């Protein structure tokens, strides 16, 4: 809680991964303060909330009075998310102080491990004085699996227009796959279908797990003692080629007594067993009107005119619930495994339950507009 990480300390931390908003390094020293920990550091695109955000989240006073963005994230998870999702599998993390120069040194350090396109978009935000400390979930040999399940339900909103009726039967994930191909963000369409994974059925869960393994993209990753053996490093990756499969099968040696097929069934049973996806789904379902509905409430709230009648409090609630749901739609799950009736213990943890910026309603709408219009054109 007091400490300040300094420039010398930067050498204790190694590239682990990143999303669009955060860098993650695993601790590689021997100080029991950081063994089995990762550090998550915010990137700046290449304070603290707006007035609108302050009002939107007013229900939690501590939340809206957050001194910086790390505390913000911490209280968001603690004060908003954990009450809906439960504390069993969720951890808001511990804030630690960092020196500007520790950050710059860390930024300089990991550049070469990062995907080029992530580097073009962003680096660490060296203006921050805090970072967040979390338990490394790839350490229970430990086999660790990450799933980014995305949104597991179909909109049903009275506010989806005639033209966009397909939004009602095809999943957001599937339609999005078309556009990503179009923008060269992936090479193949994914096999994974979120509706299977969230379907509650054993057969369909195993089906989705096989899909994630065939085309991991940025939705599936496996770690052995914290080292990447399947999946991308900071990005989506290509289909699992026979060569990659081969390597994965070998890497499984010792952990599984036999092996890949076994692993998938093992992953599937943990998923379907923990029923951890059910609570998540209910939170994703907080998006009750779809963006095509909620966007209207957004413009009432920032008090501009619908460019596209409820009382204020109602509009606020809808938009609030929208962002909470956006958090649930984009978070990840990590499942820790530790050793025919072979038996494995497992842990499940949610990660990346980030607070989403209110400004994003506008781009949420645009992107959604783009997904469906392009999907319609293609059919």
Ligand X SMILES: Nc1ncnc2c1ncn2[C@@H]1O[C@H](COP(=O)(O)OP(=O)(O)O)[C@@H](O)[C@H]1O
Ligand Y SMILES: O=P(O)(O)O[C@H]1[C@H](OP(=O)(O)O)[C@@H](OP(=O)(O)O)[C@H](OP(=O)(O)O)[C@@H](OP(=O)(O)O)[C@@H]1OP(=O)(O)O
- Annotated binding site for ATP: which residue ranges? 19-22, 40, 135-137, 146-148, 221, 352
Of the candidate spans 15-23, 201-209, 240-248, 290-298, the one that interacts with ligand X by CB under 6 A turns out to be 15-23
Is 25 buried (19+), middle (13-18) or exposed (0-12) by CB count in 10 A?
buried
Assess 238 for contact with ligand Y (CB under 6 A).
no
165 binds, among Mg ion, its own copies, Zn ion, none (CB under 5 to 8 A by kind): its own copies
Q: Which amino acids are annotated as binding site for substrate, given as ranges?
A: 45, 118, 150, 180, 218, 330, 356, 360, 364
Residue 218 interacts with which of ligand X, Mg ion, ligand Y, none, CB < 5 to 8 Å by class: ligand Y
- Nearest to ligand X of 32, 307 (CB atom): 32
Q: Given candidates 5, 21, 77, 224, which one binds ligand Y under the rule CB under 6 A?
A: 21
Site string for ligand Y, 127-166 (x = CB under 6 A): -----------------------x----------------
* Interactions with ligand X, residue window 85-144 (CB under 6 A): 134-138
CB of 222 to ligand X, least distance (A): 10
Q: Does 356 bind ligand X (CB under 6 A)?
A: no
Q: Which is nearer to ligand Y, 21 or 26 (CB)?
A: 21
Q: Min. distance of Cβ 150 from Mg ion in angstroms?
A: 11
CA–CA distances in Å: residue 203 to residues 8, 22, 154, 282, 339: 51, 35, 20, 21, 24
Instruction: By CB under 6 A, name the one of 352, 362, 369, 374 that touches ligand Y.
Output: 352
> Of 20 and 200, which has the nearer Cβ to ligand X?
20
Answer for which of 3, 4, 20, 165 binds ligand Y (CB under 6 A) is 20
The one of ligand X, its own copies, Mg ion, none whose footprint includes residue 289, by CB under 5 to 8 A per kind, is its own copies
356 touches, from ligand Y, Mg ion, ligand X, none (C-beta below 5 to 8 Å by class) = ligand Y
Full 3-state SS string of the chain: CCCCECHHHHHHEEEEEECCCEEEEEECCCCCCCCCEEEEEEEEECCCCCHHHHHHCCCCHHHHCCCCHHHHHHHHHHHHHHHHHCCCCCCCCEEEEECHHHHHHHHHHHHHHCCHHHHHHEEECCCCCEEEEEECCCCCCEEEEEECCCCCCCCCCCCCCHHHHHHHCCCHHHHHHHHHHHCCCCCCCCCCCHHHHCCCCHHHHHHHHHHHHHCCECCEEEEECCEEEECCCCCCECCCCHHHHHHHHHHCECCECCCHHHHHHHHHHHHHHHCHHHHHHHHHCCCCCHHHHHHHHHHHHCCCCCCCCCCHHHHHHHHHHHHHHHHHHHCEEEEEEECCCCCCEEEEEEECCCCCCCCHHHHHHHHHHHHHHHHHHHC
Among 19, 149, 231, 234, binds Mg ion (CB under 5 A): 19
Residue 323 is a binding residue for ligand Y (CB under 6 A)? no
Please say which residue, 260 or 327, places its beta carbon nearer to ligand Y: 327
Work out whether 194 is an interface residue with ligand Y (CB under 6 A). no
* Contact positions vs ligand X (CB under 6 A): 16-22, 24, 38, 40, 134-138, 146, 221, 332, 334, 351-352, 354
């Amino acid at each position: 809680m007091e400490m300040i990480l300094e420039e010398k300390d930067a050498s204790d931390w190694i590239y682990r991964g990143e999303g669009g908003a955060n860098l993650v390094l695993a601790y590689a020293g021997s100080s029991p303060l950081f063994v089995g920990k990762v550090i998550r550091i915010q990137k700046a695109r290449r304070s603290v909330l707006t007035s609108d955000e302050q009002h939107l989240w007013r229900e939690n006073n501590e939340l809206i009075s957050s001194p910086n963005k790390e505390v913000l994230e911490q209280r968001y998870v603690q004060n908003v998310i954990i009450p809906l999702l439960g504390p069993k599998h969720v951890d808001a993390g511990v804030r630690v102080s960092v020196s500007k120069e520790f950050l710059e040194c860390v930024d300089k350090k990991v550049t070469k491990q990062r995907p080029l396109w992530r580097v073009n978009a962003a680096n660490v935000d060296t203006s921050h004085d805090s970072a967040l400390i979390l338990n490394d979930h790839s350490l229970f040999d430990c086999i660790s699996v990450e799933i980014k399940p995305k949104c597991g339900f179909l909109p049903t909103s009275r506010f989806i227009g005639k033209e966009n009726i397909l939004k009602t039967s095809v999943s957001r994930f599937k339609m999005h796959q078309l556009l990503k191909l179009e923008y060269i963000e992936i090479s193949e369409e994914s096999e994974y279908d979120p509706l299977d994974l969230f379907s509650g059925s054993k057969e369909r869960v195993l089906e989705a797990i096989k899909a994630l393994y065939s085309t991991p993209q940025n939705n599936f990753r496996v770690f052995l003692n914290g080292s990447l053996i399947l999946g991308g490093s900071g990005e989506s990756t290509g289909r699992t080629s026979p060569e990659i499969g081969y390597a994965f099968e070998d890497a499984l040696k010792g952990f599984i007594q036999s092996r890949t097929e076994c692993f998938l069934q093992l992953v599937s049973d943990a998923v379907y067993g923990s029923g951890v996806l059910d609570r998540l789904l209910e939170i994703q379902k907080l998006d009750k009107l779809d963006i095509e509905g909620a966007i209207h409430c957004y413009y009432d709230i920032i008090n501009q005119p619908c460019p596209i009648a409820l009382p204020l409090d109602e509009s606020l609630k809808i938009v609030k619930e929208y962002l909470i749901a956006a958090t649930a739609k984009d978070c990840s799950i990590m499942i820790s495994f530790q050793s025919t009736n072979q038996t494995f213990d497992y842990k499940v943890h949610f990660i990346d339950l980030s607070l989403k910026p209110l400004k994003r309603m506008e781009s949420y709408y645009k992107l959604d507009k783009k997904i469906i219009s392009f999907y319609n054109r293609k059919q």
